[PDB]
Structures are given as structure tokens and as C-alpha cells.
Design a protein around this ligand. Sequence first.
Ligand SMILES: [Mg+2]
Ligand SMILES: [Mg+2]
Lengths: 294, 294
Amino acid sequence: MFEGFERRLVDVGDVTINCVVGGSGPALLLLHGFPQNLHMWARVAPLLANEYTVVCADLRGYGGSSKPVGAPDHANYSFRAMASDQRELMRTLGFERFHLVGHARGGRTGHRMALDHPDSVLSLAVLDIIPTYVMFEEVDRFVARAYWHWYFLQQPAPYPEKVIGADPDTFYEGCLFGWGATGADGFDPEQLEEYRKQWRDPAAIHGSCCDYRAGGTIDFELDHGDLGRQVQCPALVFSGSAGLMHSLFEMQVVWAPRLANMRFASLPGGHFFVDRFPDDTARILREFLSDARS
Amino acid sequence: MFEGFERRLVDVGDVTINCVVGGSGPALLLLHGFPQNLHMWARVAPLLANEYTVVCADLRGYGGSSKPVGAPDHANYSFRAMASDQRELMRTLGFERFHLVGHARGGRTGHRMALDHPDSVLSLAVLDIIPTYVMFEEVDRFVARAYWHWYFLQQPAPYPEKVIGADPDTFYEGCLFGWGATGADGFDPEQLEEYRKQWRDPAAIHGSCCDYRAGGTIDFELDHGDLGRQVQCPALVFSGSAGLMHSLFEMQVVWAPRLANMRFASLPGGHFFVDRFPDDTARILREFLSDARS
Ligand SMILES: [Mg+2]
Ligand SMILES: [Mg+2]
């Protein structure tokens, strides 16, 4: 995987970020979600590398990046903290400005990055997410049942860590196949094994739980403070039309108040559609990035 | 435990209900909750047996009772079905009418029994519960986080069964100590060991998951259909004032429209207050039952 890409472990302050870098042209940062890592982009990234300098990075708590113990207030796993790591990564790699594509947790990281440092983000694509604020503020019995993990993963350490730790493969496969609504046949064996390595790492189990703990506290509060602000750069809301969130919310309705320049796309998959549709994901991203640059 | 009580396995139709029966006087049915069984009453029941014929029974899916495989629509684990078992148990024991005290799932079973067959229920005590309808209809980010299990346990079989099955002690201890807000020191070791036997029983893991699956579907729908009906018999709403539900809702406000003759009481414990305060639980129930009879 990632043939010809350079593998780098980059110190960005108090953490180290694992990434791969390949291609040439404008910078494009690809950020993964949960329970995955930069390997979700193993097929997409080489496709886009003919036109972009593609950086795929692991979020703090995930993959090969640092996974500090979560602070009592979860602040070291906020999307603000996660975004700072990634912006600093790009700067260290020589990129003051870059296009940003984020799935799930990476999309939330991107939204926060664009709010905190608008000048760094040339365009923003958010893949299969409803805004964090909306997820919580507009929760009902259907939303809570569909994305049950938003509540389980908030339970205080070490409870979810120990429950998950007893059988990580069962737990996380249920994330892919259940709330993730993406059938097993849609996953490439090589990429799936990279996810499995992380699933079995207790430090990653903890880091990802802390991400969710922050999600329901510090992130919710920061997002609340920013209500009414719109990201100004070109944005793409790119969903899985066979996923749970595409059907309980209208993507266009929840994102319009947050994005001044919004385009939409979807693929007929679940939350983990990038795993099943890498060529079509690259196609849609390529078109959007071209539009954004025009 | 339950010295002097008769132990009975009673066929009530398509299931067998496990129970213990002691004392003399009017019938008093005590129904447990989750993740417990009739042993939650091991200290309360002998105290009340000087004035009541006390029957402590295991709900279907729990303890020593039948635990059928859940139907696709969960209807065989509805509170209606659970109530029918217990009403028939009492009839077989010679009681057409009886006082009913239910904690949690048993309280919900009791409420449904009083709605379906009001003539059978002489008085109703509901211990540390907010009505199912309210739990779901009025869910918000706080309620969903507090009682996260209401969503996790609804996930389709066999997913929660397998997650729990990998380490039932960790999982269920987290129910007692976490959302249950009842510290370990409040549990009698003898009672705890009987809970633990059930925790490790795969048939009980499944049965209790099905209870929650019905809880969010058939039970919610049946309850919705009965909105505006009031239970007419004397009723007691009896909460743990140090528990999560007592503080997230006003017990008296959520129950008042549902109960025409309502009294309220509390003890300074969490959801599992009966474990820590058996003598005081018996005292409060005894006073209520005396008042109800008058
Ligand atoms: Mg976060
Ligand atoms: Mg039920």
C-alpha cells in the first residue's frame, strides 16, 4: 500500500503524527475517522496523487500517532487539539495552505480547523457527517439508537476501554457493519488488517474513546459558541446514501447554516463508503477540487 | 437466603417462572430489574413476610425463569408479555388480586399489568423509573449519555450478546456502579453472587437484551397508545435521590398524569438503592401498603 509514498513520523509539539506523503501539485490532506486510520485512503490517495501532493495522516489517538492519556476534561482530545496537530503537520511539511478532506472524526477535525484557521484551509470536504452540535442537540430515540456509540463511548474510563478490550474485533466489526451500515464484502482485506491492528491496541482503544468523550463535552461547547458562523471556502458535503445519517437528517439542511459555499455529492454506500467505492470517491473529490480551484 | 420461603418453578403457559413464596396475609408480588433477579429482595422480603404473603419472581429472560429466543419483532419480551406471566403466576398461587412492587424492568412490568388488568393490582409501587414513553420521547444528550444502555442494548442480536459475553462481569458491574450510580460497598456479597451467576448466563444475556429491544419498540408503541389513561389504585413512586433519573427528571411531574392516586418517597441512594437500604425499603413499602389498604 501507498507505493512511492514517503512514510513520516513528525513531531508537531507535544505529539507525533504518523503520515504518508505522495504525489505533486497543491497540498491535499486526507483525514480518516473511527475506527480506522490513514489506510482508509490506501486506494484513493494514489489516484489523486497525479494532481495533488497527498498527505494522509493519523489523528491523535489513532493509527501510528501519539495517544496520550485523556485529561479529566477531555480537552487534549478536542477537535481543536486534533486540528492543531494536523495544521502544524502541514506547515512542517512546507504547506501553509491546503485542501482538506475528512471522513467522520477527520471531517469534524476539518470543520473545526476551518473555523479556527480559515486561511489555512483552501477547501473542505466533510464525508458522511452530521454536525456534532446537531447530532447532540437534535438527538431523538431514532438518532440515539442508530449512533448508540456516541453515548457508550462517553462513559468514564476505563469502562468502555475494558468492555471493548475483552473482544476488540467483535466490538469494532459491529461499528463497520452495524451503525456503519457497510457490509463486510465492501472492505479490502489489506486495509481491514490495518484497522484490526489498531482495534487491538489498548492505547488506540483509549484514544478513540477520549475523542468521543471530548465530542460530547468540549467539542459540543466550542461548536455552540460558533453557531451562526459559516466556513467561507468551497465546501463539499459528501455522504453515503445507504447510511443511517443520510436518512435521519437532510445533509443540505444541517450544513447550510455552517457552510457559505456548499456543494453536495453521495455514493450508494453506508458510512464506510470509501472502503467500497475508492475509485468513485477519488472521482468525486477530483471534480470538487477542480471546482474549488476554479 | 429466603429461609422458610418455598421455592417454586411454575409453568404459566409457554414459559416457566421461577419464584420464592413466604409469609402470610395479603399477596405482595415483588418484581426485580436489570441486571438482577429475585435475589434483590433477599432482605426486604423476609421483613415484609410478617404481614404479607410475599412472592418474589424472576421475569422472563432473567434469573431462573424461561429465556426464549427473542422474536424478530421482540413481542415475546414486551412488558405486556412479562406482565401476563406474572399475573398468571399469582393466579396459579391462588391470588386473583395482589399488591405489586416493581423495580426498574419490574416496575415497568407492573405499570403495564395495572393498565392491562387493573382489577388484579391492588396497589402499585414503581421503584426508580421514569416512564418508558418519557425516557424516549424526552431524550436529550444528557438522558442518552446517562442511560446509554437503553440504546446499546437495542442493537440487533447477536452483537450486544457477544460484546457482553466476552466479559460479563466488567459489563454488568458497570451497570451497577455507572448508570446505576450505586457504589460497590452497597452490595451484599451473597446477593451479588446470585446476580453474577445471571451475568454469566448466555441465555440471560440474550433475554435481557431482548427486554431492551422490546423496550424501544413494542413497549414504546403500546405506551403511546395508552397516553392519558390513569392507573386508579393507590400508587407509590419511590426513587433513589442520589441516582441519575431522580435528577434528570422530576419524578412527581412525569408520573402525576399517569397515576390518579400517587404518593412519593425516596432514599438517598442510586438506582440500586434496595441493595444498600433493604430495611428502609421495607419500612417505606410497609407504610405505603398500610396506607393503600386504608
Ligand atoms: Mg473530539
Ligand atoms: Mg420489555
